[PDB]
Coordinates of all heavy atoms in Angstrom, one line a residue:
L211 N 87.1 111.7 65.1 CA 87.1 111.5 63.6 C 88.4 112.1 63.1 O 88.7 112.0 61.9 CB 85.9 112.1 62.9 CG 85.4 111.8 61.5 CD1 83.9 111.8 61.4 CD2 85.9 112.9 60.5
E212 N 89.3 112.7 64.0 CA 90.6 113.1 63.6 C 91.6 112.5 64.5 O 92.8 112.3 64.1 CB 90.6 114.7 63.7 CG 91.9 115.3 63.2 CD 93.0 115.5 64.3 OE1 92.6 115.7 65.5 OE2 94.2 115.4 64.0
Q213 N 91.3 112.3 65.8 CA 92.3 111.9 66.8 C 92.9 110.6 66.6 O 94.1 110.3 66.7 CB 91.7 112.1 68.2 CG 92.7 111.8 69.3 CD 93.8 112.8 69.3 OE1 94.9 112.5 68.8 NE2 93.6 114.0 69.8
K214 N 92.0 109.6 66.3 CA 92.5 108.2 66.1 C 93.1 108.0 64.8 O 94.1 107.3 64.6 CB 91.3 107.2 66.4 CG 91.7 105.8 66.4 CD 90.6 104.9 66.9 CE 89.4 104.8 66.0 NZ 89.8 104.1 64.7
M215 N 92.6 108.7 63.7 CA 93.2 108.6 62.4 C 94.5 109.3 62.3 O 95.2 109.2 61.3 CB 92.2 109.1 61.3 CG 92.0 110.6 61.3 SD 91.1 111.1 59.9 CE 92.3 110.7 58.6
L216 N 94.8 110.2 63.2 CA 96.2 110.7 63.3 C 97.1 109.8 64.1 O 98.3 109.7 63.8 CB 96.2 112.1 63.9 CG 97.5 112.9 64.0 CD1 97.3 114.4 63.6 CD2 98.1 112.8 65.4
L217 N 96.5 109.1 65.1 CA 97.3 108.3 66.0 C 97.7 107.0 65.3 O 98.9 106.7 65.2 CB 96.6 108.0 67.3 CG 97.2 107.4 68.5 CD1 96.6 108.0 69.7 CD2 97.1 105.9 68.6
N218 N 96.7 106.2 64.8 CA 97.0 104.9 64.3 C 97.7 105.0 62.9 O 98.4 104.0 62.6 CB 95.7 104.2 64.1 CG 95.9 102.7 64.0 OD1 97.0 102.1 64.1 ND2 94.8 102.0 63.7
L219 N 97.6 106.1 62.2 CA 98.2 106.2 60.9 C 99.6 106.7 60.9 O 100.3 106.6 60.0 CB 97.3 107.1 60.0 CG 96.1 106.5 59.2 CD1 95.0 106.1 60.2 CD2 95.6 107.6 58.3
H220 N 100.0 107.4 62.0 CA 101.4 108.0 62.1 C 102.4 107.0 62.7 O 103.5 107.0 62.3 CB 101.3 109.2 62.9 CG 102.7 110.0 62.9 ND1 103.7 109.7 63.9 CD2 103.1 111.0 62.1 CE1 104.7 110.5 63.6 NE2 104.4 111.3 62.6
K221 N 101.9 106.2 63.7 CA 102.8 105.2 64.3 C 102.1 103.8 64.2 O 101.2 103.5 64.9 CB 103.0 105.5 65.8 CG 103.7 106.8 66.1 CD 105.1 106.7 65.5 CE 105.9 108.0 65.8 NZ 107.3 108.0 65.3
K222 N 102.7 103.0 63.3 CA 102.1 101.7 62.9 C 103.1 100.9 62.1 O 103.9 101.5 61.3 CB 100.8 102.0 62.0 CG 100.0 100.7 61.8 CD 98.7 101.1 61.1 CE 97.8 99.9 60.8 NZ 96.5 100.4 60.2
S223 N 103.1 99.6 62.4 CA 103.9 98.7 61.6 C 103.3 97.3 61.8 O 103.2 96.8 62.9 CB 105.4 98.7 62.1 OG 105.5 98.2 63.5
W224 N 102.9 96.7 60.7 CA 102.1 95.5 60.7 C 102.9 94.2 61.0 O 102.7 93.5 62.0 CB 101.4 95.3 59.4 CG 100.6 94.1 59.4 CD1 99.5 93.8 60.2 CD2 100.8 93.0 58.5 NE1 99.0 92.5 59.9 CE2 99.8 92.0 58.8 CE3 101.7 92.7 57.5 CZ2 99.7 90.8 58.2 CZ3 101.6 91.5 56.8 CH2 100.6 90.5 57.2
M225 N 103.9 93.9 60.2 CA 104.6 92.7 60.2 C 105.8 92.7 61.2 O 106.5 91.7 61.4 CB 105.1 92.3 58.9 CG 106.3 93.1 58.4 SD 105.9 94.8 58.1 CE 104.9 94.6 56.6
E226 N 106.0 93.9 61.8 CA 107.2 94.0 62.7 C 107.0 93.2 64.0 O 108.0 92.7 64.6 CB 107.4 95.5 63.1 CG 108.6 95.8 63.9 CD 108.8 97.2 64.3 OE1 108.0 98.1 63.9 OE2 109.8 97.5 65.0
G227 N 105.7 93.0 64.4 CA 105.5 92.3 65.7 C 105.9 90.9 65.8 O 106.0 90.4 67.0
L228 N 106.1 90.2 64.7 CA 106.6 88.8 64.7 C 107.8 88.6 63.9 O 108.0 87.5 63.3 CB 105.4 87.9 64.3 CG 104.8 87.9 63.0 CD1 104.1 86.5 62.7 CD2 103.7 89.0 62.8
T229 N 108.7 89.6 63.9 CA 110.0 89.4 63.3 C 111.0 88.7 64.3 O 110.6 88.5 65.5 CB 110.6 90.7 62.8 OG1 110.7 91.7 63.9 CG2 109.7 91.2 61.7
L230 N 112.2 88.5 64.0 CA 113.1 87.7 64.8 C 114.3 88.3 65.3 O 114.7 88.0 66.4 CB 113.4 86.3 64.1 CG 112.4 85.2 64.1 CD1 112.1 84.8 65.6 CD2 111.2 85.4 63.3
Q231 N 114.9 89.2 64.5 CA 116.3 89.8 64.6 C 117.3 88.7 65.1 O 118.0 88.9 66.1 CB 116.3 91.1 65.5 CG 115.8 91.0 66.9 CD 115.8 92.3 67.6 OE1 116.2 93.3 67.1 NE2 115.3 92.3 68.9
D232 N 117.4 87.7 64.3 CA 117.1 86.3 64.8 C 118.0 85.9 66.0 O 117.6 86.1 67.1 CB 117.3 85.4 63.6 CG 116.6 84.1 63.8 OD1 115.8 84.0 64.8 OD2 116.7 83.1 63.0
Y233 N 119.2 85.4 65.7 CA 119.9 84.6 66.7 C 121.4 84.9 66.8 O 121.9 84.9 67.9 CB 119.7 83.1 66.5 CG 118.3 82.6 66.9 CD1 117.5 81.7 66.2 CD2 117.7 83.2 68.1 CE1 116.3 81.4 66.6 CE2 116.4 82.8 68.5 CZ 115.7 81.9 67.7 OH 114.5 81.5 68.1
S234 N 122.0 85.2 65.7 CA 123.4 85.5 65.7 C 123.7 86.9 66.3 O 124.8 87.1 66.9 CB 124.0 85.5 64.3 OG 123.4 86.5 63.5
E235 N 122.7 87.8 66.3 CA 122.8 89.1 67.0 C 122.3 89.0 68.4 O 122.5 89.9 69.2 CB 122.0 90.1 66.2 CG 122.5 90.4 64.8 CD 121.9 89.5 63.8 OE1 121.0 88.7 64.1 OE2 122.3 89.6 62.6
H236 N 121.6 87.9 68.7 CA 120.8 87.7 69.9 C 121.5 86.8 71.0 O 121.4 87.1 72.2 CB 119.4 87.2 69.6 CG 118.5 87.2 70.8 ND1 118.3 86.1 71.6 CD2 117.6 88.1 71.3 CE1 117.4 86.4 72.6 NE2 117.0 87.6 72.4
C237 N 122.1 85.7 70.5 CA 122.9 84.9 71.4 C 124.1 85.6 71.9 O 124.6 85.3 73.0 CB 123.2 83.6 70.7 SG 124.0 82.4 71.8
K238 N 124.7 86.5 71.0 CA 125.8 87.3 71.4 C 125.4 88.3 72.6 O 126.2 88.5 73.5 CB 126.3 88.1 70.2 CG 127.6 88.9 70.5 CD 128.7 88.1 70.9 CE 129.3 87.3 69.7 NZ 130.5 86.5 70.1
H239 N 124.2 88.8 72.5 CA 123.7 89.7 73.6 C 123.5 88.9 74.8 O 123.7 89.4 75.9 CB 122.5 90.4 73.1 CG 122.0 91.5 74.1 ND1 121.2 91.2 75.1 CD2 122.3 92.8 74.1 CE1 121.0 92.3 75.8 NE2 121.6 93.3 75.2
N240 N 122.9 87.7 74.7 CA 122.8 86.8 75.9 C 124.1 86.4 76.4 O 124.3 86.1 77.6 CB 121.9 85.6 75.6 CG 120.5 86.0 75.4 OD1 119.9 86.8 76.1 ND2 119.8 85.3 74.4
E241 N 125.1 86.3 75.6 CA 126.5 86.0 76.0 C 127.1 87.1 76.9 O 127.7 86.9 77.9 CB 127.4 85.7 74.8 CG 128.8 85.5 75.2 CD 129.0 84.3 76.0 OE1 128.4 83.3 75.7 OE2 129.7 84.4 77.0
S242 N 126.8 88.4 76.5 CA 127.5 89.5 77.0 C 127.1 89.8 78.5 O 127.9 90.0 79.4 CB 127.4 90.7 76.2 OG 128.0 90.5 74.9
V243 N 125.7 89.9 78.6 CA 125.2 90.5 79.8 C 125.4 89.7 81.1 O 125.6 90.2 82.2 CB 123.7 90.8 79.6 CG1 123.0 91.4 80.8 CG2 123.5 91.7 78.4
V244 N 125.5 88.4 80.9 CA 125.7 87.4 82.0 C 127.1 87.6 82.6 O 127.3 87.4 83.8 CB 125.5 86.0 81.5 CG1 125.7 84.9 82.6 CG2 124.1 85.9 80.9
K245 N 128.1 88.0 81.8 CA 129.5 88.1 82.2 C 129.7 89.2 83.3 O 130.3 88.9 84.3 CB 130.4 88.3 81.0 CG 131.9 88.2 81.4 CD 132.7 88.3 80.2 CE 133.2 87.0 79.6 NZ 132.1 86.3 78.9
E246 N 129.2 90.4 83.0 CA 129.3 91.4 84.1 C 128.3 91.2 85.2 O 128.5 91.7 86.3 CB 129.1 92.8 83.5 CG 127.7 93.2 83.0 CD 127.5 92.9 81.6 OE1 128.4 92.3 81.0 OE2 126.5 93.4 81.0
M247 N 127.2 90.5 84.9 CA 126.2 90.2 85.9 C 126.8 89.2 86.9 O 126.4 89.1 88.1 CB 124.9 89.6 85.3 CG 123.8 89.4 86.2 SD 123.7 87.7 86.8 CE 122.3 87.7 87.9
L248 N 127.8 88.4 86.5 CA 128.6 87.5 87.4 C 129.4 88.4 88.3 O 129.4 88.1 89.5 CB 129.5 86.6 86.5 CG 130.3 85.4 87.1 CD1 130.4 84.4 86.0 CD2 131.7 85.8 87.5
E249 N 130.1 89.4 87.8 CA 130.8 90.3 88.7 C 129.9 91.2 89.5 O 130.2 91.6 90.6 CB 131.8 91.1 87.8 CG 132.7 92.1 88.6 CD 133.7 91.3 89.5 OE1 134.1 90.2 89.1 OE2 134.1 91.8 90.6
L250 N 128.7 91.5 88.9 CA 127.7 92.2 89.7 C 127.2 91.3 90.8 O 126.8 91.8 91.9 CB 126.5 92.6 88.8 CG 125.4 93.6 89.2 CD1 124.3 92.9 90.0 CD2 126.0 94.7 90.0
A251 N 127.2 90.0 90.6 CA 126.8 89.1 91.7 C 128.0 89.0 92.7 O 127.7 88.8 93.9 CB 126.5 87.7 91.2
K252 N 129.2 89.1 92.2 CA 130.3 89.1 93.2 C 130.4 90.4 94.0 O 130.7 90.3 95.2 CB 131.6 88.9 92.4 CG 132.9 88.8 93.2 CD 132.8 87.6 94.1 CE 134.0 87.5 95.0 NZ 135.3 87.3 94.3
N253 N 130.0 91.5 93.4 CA 129.9 92.7 94.1 C 128.6 92.6 95.0 O 128.6 93.3 96.1 CB 129.8 93.9 93.2 CG 130.2 95.2 93.8 OD1 130.4 96.2 93.2 ND2 130.5 95.2 95.1
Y254 N 127.6 91.9 94.7 CA 126.5 91.7 95.5 C 126.8 90.8 96.7 O 126.3 90.9 97.8 CB 125.3 91.1 94.8 CG 124.0 91.1 95.6 CD1 123.3 92.3 95.8 CD2 123.5 90.0 96.2 CE1 122.2 92.3 96.6 CE2 122.4 90.0 97.0 CZ 121.7 91.2 97.1 OH 120.5 91.3 97.9
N255 N 127.8 89.9 96.5 CA 128.3 89.1 97.6 C 129.0 89.9 98.7 O 128.8 89.7 99.9 CB 129.2 87.9 97.1 CG 129.4 86.9 98.2 OD1 128.8 86.9 99.3 ND2 130.3 85.9 97.9
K256 N 129.8 90.9 98.2 CA 130.7 91.7 99.0 C 130.0 92.5 100.0 O 130.4 92.6 101.2 CB 131.6 92.5 98.1 CG 132.6 93.4 98.8 CD 133.7 92.5 99.5 CE 134.7 93.4 100.1 NZ 134.2 94.2 101.2

C-alpha cells in the first residue's frame, strides 16, 4: 500500500511510449554507425 504507489508514481510517462524522435535525427544515426562498422568489418577480415 506504499511500495507500488511510490514506484509507479515516481517513474512514469504515458505518451512517451509511442513517440517518434522522428527521422531527420534518426536516419543520420543510421547513416553514421554503418560507416565505421564497414571498417570494423575490414578489421574483422584482417
Side-chain angles (χ1 to χ4, degrees):
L211 195 145
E212 188 269 329
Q213 183 61 259
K214 185 168 71 66
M215 72 171 290
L216 183 140
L217 192 146
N218 199 5
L219 277 66
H220 187 272
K221 296 295 183 183
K222 190 173 182 177
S223 64
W224 177 64
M225 75 293 290
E226 186 182 1
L228 63 157
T229 57
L230 276 305
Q231 60 181 357
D232 204 8
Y233 282 139
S234 65
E235 299 87 3
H236 188 269
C237 184
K238 182 64 70 177
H239 188 273
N240 289 320
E241 175 65 41
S242 297
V243 180
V244 179
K245 187 178 263 77
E246 71 266 12
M247 185 267 177
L248 190 148
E249 185 65 30
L250 193 276
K252 183 64 182 293
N253 206 169
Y254 189 75
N255 194 5
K256 180 68 174 65

